[PDB]
Design a protein around this ligand. Sequence first.
Ligand SMILES: [Zn+2]
Lengths: 49, 103, 117, 50, 50, 48, 48
Amino acid sequence: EAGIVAIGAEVQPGDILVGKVTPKGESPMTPEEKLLRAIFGEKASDVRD
Amino acid sequence: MSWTDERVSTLKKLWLDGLSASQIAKQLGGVTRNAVIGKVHRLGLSPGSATVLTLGAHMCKWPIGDPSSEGFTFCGRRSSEGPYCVEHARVAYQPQQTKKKSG
Amino acid sequence: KVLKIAKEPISLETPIGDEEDSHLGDFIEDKNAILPIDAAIQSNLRETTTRVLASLTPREERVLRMRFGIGMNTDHTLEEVGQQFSVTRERIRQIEAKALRKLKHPSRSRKLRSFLD
Amino acid sequence: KRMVEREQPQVWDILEEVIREHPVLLNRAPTLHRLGIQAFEPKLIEGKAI
Amino acid sequence: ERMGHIELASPVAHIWFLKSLPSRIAMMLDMPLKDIERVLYFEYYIVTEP
Amino acid sequence: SIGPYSLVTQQPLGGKAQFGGQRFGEMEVWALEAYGAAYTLQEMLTVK
Amino acid sequence: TERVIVSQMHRSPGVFFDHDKGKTHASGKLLFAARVIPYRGSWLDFEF
DNA sequence: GCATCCGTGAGTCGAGGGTAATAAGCAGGGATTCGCCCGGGTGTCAACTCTTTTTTT
DNA sequence: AAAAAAAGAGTTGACACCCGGGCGAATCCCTGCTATAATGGGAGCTGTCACGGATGC
Ligand SMILES: [Zn+2]
């Protein structure tokens, strides 16, 4: 729950070892992506992976 | 204080004609010092033998007396290749020049 | 806030390796650059958006392309599109909602769902 | 792009079909003569050694 | 693709056309390279229009 | 296949640390010039 | 990460008498140069 | 016509990964910058009227 | 054989709100002024040649 993999956990190439999110500033988006987001109703997150 | 149409006009006029910015708020009344600065920033538009006159080239220039006194003149003698005279060149500059360093 | 000032930034020519070669300028990534795989995904999305906008009526498609700048460089607000359209302010939202509901069907928005994921 | 990431078993058949006659260039580090760069026909094989 | 220029209060001599192997400035008007370095360093005074 | 590019040169980075690219050395360009290949060396230095 | 320090090997700070084997000269001859290379200081030479 | 002194060169691909030191003080006046708040243009909804394609008679 | 309405349009008021532009206030940057006597500076090669050229009498 803290974001770190448990000791003795099998991991594969390209796996999330430590989940860290950083605050991302507001950036302009293409109109097609905005239309798709409005169609699906999901809200764009303000944090970056 | 107030910010009517006449308040901005008189403020701009008093800032343009010239006056201390600190007294600008007091003359207008009510407005403080910080308000007028913000308004102007937001709105924009923010004995010898020669006197001191008969001193020619190649002459002594060692002063004698007090310049703020009645009689103040210079020597005015044969003192070419030097500002001061030979009689004062040894008393003005550092006598017995002995200095050296590395280079 | 006084601490963490980042004074005296490291020179980009400092040799990272023990030898003279392999400077610090090589071990640096460019963040502003966009990868070609990302740009290729944008073309696919721009083309699929035109194909999906073929079953709707001309009025709803026109109002959607006017409010959302799909083929237009400048965006248009609700009042701006209403001044040019018959419906002044109110029914434009209803037309947009109807067009959005028409696109929410899985049969019509099956290929378009993979972009969001 | 998501199908090849998870490495589905169906992608192997597409890889063998695409790599049929596409020649790849192989060259050693000290390329002294022009023979150091020679093209070949790649063939899928296990392991990590060319 | 945008460049900027810096204004100089006094003229300066190019280093490439001065300290290169063949003295380009010295080749003009038959001037030795040893004399040009003295004038640039403000050591001596050159006379013109006699 | 496609990785992060350089900062000032706008070229693919080097080294196996973060998606390096095999450097096409100067001697390798002479090999293509020896052969009659002119389009393989033209696209391998500009569009890649 | 532990880091060890390897020993360094350099010339001894003493006087030497090295003469070139007939090189860097117009005709065949020897120079017989002598050095007074100290540990920390300016070097000295008495080349012929 | 020779003797003495100052520039260029040194293969090529690969590994390896981050760095580091000095340190006056306070008084005057302006330009800058962060909090609150009224506000007018943008959205999101109750709720009153023509048209018409049938579905019922 | 006839004949009117849930939607489909079309609006009409009724909030909810969301950055913008001012009003403040709180606080940064610049600049100058300090009164015993201060009076020329610290690395750096020097364990490659060889060529090819630039100065001098
Ligand atoms: Zn005198």
